[PDB]
């Protein structure tokens, strides 16, 4: 054989060289660094009003406004500072799995099992919120979506692919393929020039938004990936999985850097988020709690067990003042 | 201490709370039924017979049912079955006419599954005009050697029904309601109505501890 032999020998030799040139793990270089202690955080605000499971939640860029979607087919925009409901958007499909808040603050994006990314305009002259656009073309369910700008958004899908759209035209500018399983989460880089996405094929990968080419792929995993997020500098990313482990990868070494697992943890991770410093990795599990992990020591730096149901979504403000956590118990909680 | 504007903000929040509560109530009087099964298992036939994700809202005897057909999701990754908790029932459609082994493994999957531990399932063999003619070709041993009964419709059909029921290893909590009557008769919905009524009554009793 030549094509099979070529593929096998390539993969083997690249991976062997990567392993050989690997110097040390994340923990090996930070052993001298002192820990953070116990991250004891209190529920400062509790957002009541959602009457079903909360699936997605995204902070606004002002670090004061929130948007959350519930299984009840409702997208609530909250004023976290006073828990003062700013907007209530009735979604067209009640099966919504992702939320995004536009960096400018004029738009919010949502969607789910309807295979459509709906974009709603907040700053209208009529005093209400309306459906600005609907992006269609994905075949599998809508896993995640993130605004690049006021007119350019990126989406992941069960279509085993991703899509870069142009909101004005409504057509998908680029289609990113290469995954073999359902793509469950995408994170946008701070400079909005790349992104990373994990799929049900138990693999993650870095995709370039401009060239539409598959820049890199990362493996070393047992189960599917349900959550992914960038380090605040866009030089790494953490993934969460049904494996009951969270893994931190670097996009330059091309190798997994650190593992975030504990023996007593038996269920998967639903959501992943980073501290403003990238010093605390917050992970929502199916154990009805949220764990704070020392991103450099891999130890559990605390817990947020104020919810009596799985912590479906996490989120950290842009200023790092508070953490929003949404669970299936129909409550969002802000912690500080 | 509130300013002239914060008091109006609080008023707006309270009005939104009222609207959210009054719409959640409207959403809680609705019976959610998942529709599952293999292709050409009558899923298309049932949705028409019934009075991306395709939602069919129909009212029967004052009960408003949202039947969700998710056969459109071409990724068989069950990464959304957890979204269907709380559904009153799963309507599983299978066709007598080794596809049967495929259906059996699917039924075992949906029943055994933990998101659906207690969710009673409404098994269906809707059609009955082509389920008998093809039993004269050969008995239920084309791919099922174990059967040793009469190669007639009632005997074989009853055997298949029982073998699929046997895949329930958790009757303690959930129940299976099986249907055979021909799809042509419009009783597919009535049987669904009875089964959901039974499931709801038992959910209520199992909630006050009486059960």
């Amino acid at each position, epitope marked *: 054989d030549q094509l099979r032999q070529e593929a096998e020998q390539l993969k083997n030799q690249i991976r062997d060289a990567r392993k050989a040139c690997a110097d040390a793990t994340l923990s090996q270089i930070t052993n001298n660094i002192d820990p953070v202690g116990r991250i004891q955080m209190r529920t400062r605000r509790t957002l009541r009003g959602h009457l079903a499971k909360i699936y997605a939640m995204h902070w606004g860029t002002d670090s*004061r406004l929130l948007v959350s979607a519930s299984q009840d087919g409702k997208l609530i925009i909250w004023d976290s500072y006073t828990t003062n409901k700013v907007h209530a958007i009735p979604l067209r499909s009640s099966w919504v799995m992702t939320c995004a808040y536009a960096p400018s603050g004029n738009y919010v994006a949502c969607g789910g099992l309807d295979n459509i990314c709906s974009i709603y305009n907040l700053k209208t002259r*009529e005093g209400n919120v309306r459906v600005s656009r609907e992006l269609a073309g994905h075949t599998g369910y809508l896993s995640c979506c993130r605004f690049l700008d006021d007119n350019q958004i990126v989406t992941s899908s069960g279509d085993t692919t991703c899509a870069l759209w142009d909101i004005e035209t409504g057509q998908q500018t680029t289609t990113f393929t290469g995954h073999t399983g359902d793509v469950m989460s995408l994170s946008l880089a701070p400079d909005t020039r790349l992104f990373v996405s994990g799929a049900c094929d138990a693999s993650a990968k870095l995709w370039d938004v401009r060239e539409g080419m598959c820049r890199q792929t990362f493996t070393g995993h047992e189960s599917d990936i349900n959550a992914i997020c960038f380090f605040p500098n866009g030089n790494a990313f953490a993934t969460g999985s049904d494996d009951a482990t969270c893994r931190l990868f670097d996009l330059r070494a091309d190798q997994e850097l650190m593992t975030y697992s504990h023996d007593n943890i038996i269920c998967g991770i639903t959501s992943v988020s980073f501290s403003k410093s990238g010093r605390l990795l917050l992970a929502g599990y199916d154990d009805f709690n949220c764990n704070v992990w020392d991103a450099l020591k891999a130890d559990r730096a605390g817990v947020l067990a104020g919810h009596d149901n799985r912590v479906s979504c996490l989120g950290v403000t842009d200023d790092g003042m508070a953490v929003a956590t949404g669970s299936w118990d129909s409550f969002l909680k802000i912690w500080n | 201490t509130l*300013s002239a504007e914060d008091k*109006a903000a609080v008023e707006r929040s309270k009005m939104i709370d009222r609207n959210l509560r009054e719409d959640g109530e409207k959403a809680a009087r609705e019976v959610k039924l998942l529709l599952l099964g293999a292709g050409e298992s009558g899923k298309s036939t049932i949705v028409k017979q019934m009075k991306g994700i395709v939602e069919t809202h129909f009212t029967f005897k004052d009960l408003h049912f949202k039947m969700f057909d998710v056969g459109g999701q071409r990724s068989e990754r069950k990464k959304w079955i957890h979204c269907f908790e709380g559904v009153t029932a799963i309507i599983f459609c299978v066709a007598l006419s080794n596809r049967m082994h495929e259906s059996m493994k699917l039924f075992d999957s949906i029943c055994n599954n933990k998101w659906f531990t207690d969710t009673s399932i409404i098994l269906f063999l809707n059609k009955k005009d082509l389920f008998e003619e093809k039993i004269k070709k050969s008995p239920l041993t084309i791919c099922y050697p174990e059967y040793a009964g009469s190669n007639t419709y009632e005997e074989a059909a009853a055997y298949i029904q029982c073998q699929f029921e046997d895949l329930n290893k958790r009757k303690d909590t959930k129940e299976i309601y099986t249907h055979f009557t021909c799809a042509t008769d419009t009783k597919n919905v009535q049987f669904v109505f009875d089964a959901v009524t039974d499931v709801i009554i038992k959910n209520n009793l199992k909630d006050c501890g009486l059960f």
Partner: single-chain antibody
Framework: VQLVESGGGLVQPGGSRKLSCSAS????????MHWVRQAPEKGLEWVAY????????YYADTVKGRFTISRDDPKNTLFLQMTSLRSEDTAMYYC??????????????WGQGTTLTVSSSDIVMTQATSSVPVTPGESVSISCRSS???????????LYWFLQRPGQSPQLLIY???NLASGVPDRFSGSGSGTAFTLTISRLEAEDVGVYYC?????????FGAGTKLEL
């Protein structure tokens, strides 16, 4: 967005009437509608306020116990029923929309007004002048003073800035402090501290002539200024 008033006319003292604000082109139902008035070449004067949901109704001391404000959300129509009308109730009355949430502009749109003629504690804000000659291209600086500190504990200095052009209803320039409204040219700017407040205009144009008004929203009743005129 469109707010059209009606019901004006000439009324003898001791009569009663009902000004109507037949709004159009926006969600009037979720909007807190205010009633303002301007007496003949004397200035703007707040009349009343009704919040979204009719949960809060405020009246000016002049119309406190006399006149009422009614909402009709399903019909998108504000109302002001005036019972006893003295000779001081002669003025052109404006219907204004106002929405209150974090970051909102609470006086974005004013109506065109309707005229009413009649036969024959509160924060005080003063406008230093009433007429200022200027030519196009020369920057202008209007200013006004207030009694208390409009700066609340929120950090919001609830001072507003409207401009009324000749022969047309007032238009909102600023809504807290330099926070330019939607559709206003970027040249207009605001600033101030506590009591002294200023509005700066760079590269003045022919459409910038009129009367500048500074109002406060920290406490009710809402009090406007006299009105600083710009000449050319």
């Amino acid at each position: 967005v469109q707010l059209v008033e009606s019901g004006g006319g000439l009324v003898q003292p001791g009569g009663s009437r009902k000004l109507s604000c037949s709004a159009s082109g926006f969600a009037f139902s979720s909007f807190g509608m205010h009633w303002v008035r301007q007496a003949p070449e004397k200035g703007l004067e707040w009349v009343a306020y009704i919040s979204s949901g009719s949960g809060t109704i405020y009246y000016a001391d002049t119309v406190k116990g006399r006149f009422t404000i009614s909402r009709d959300d399903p019909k998108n129509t504000l109302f002001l029923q005036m019972t006893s009308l003295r000779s001081e109730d002669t003025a052109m009355y404006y219907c204004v929309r106002s929405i209150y949430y974090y970051g909102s502009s609470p006086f974005d749109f004013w109506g065109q007004g309707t005229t009413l003629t009649v036969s024959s504690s509160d924060i005080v804000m003063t406008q230093a002048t009433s007429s200022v000659p200027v030519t196009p291209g020369e920057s202008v600086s209007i200013s006004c003073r207030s009694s208390k500190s409009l700066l609340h504990s929120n950090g919001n200095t609830y001072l507003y800035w409207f401009l009324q052009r000749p022969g047309q209803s007032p238009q909102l320039l600023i809504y807290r402090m330099s926070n330019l409204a939607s559709g206003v040219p970027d040249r207009f700017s605001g600033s101030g501290s506590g009591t002294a407040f200023t509005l700066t205009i760079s590269r003045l144009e022919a459409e910038d002539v009129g009367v500048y008004y500074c109002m406060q929203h920290l406490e009710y009743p809402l009090t406007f200024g006299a009105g600083t005129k710009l000449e050319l």
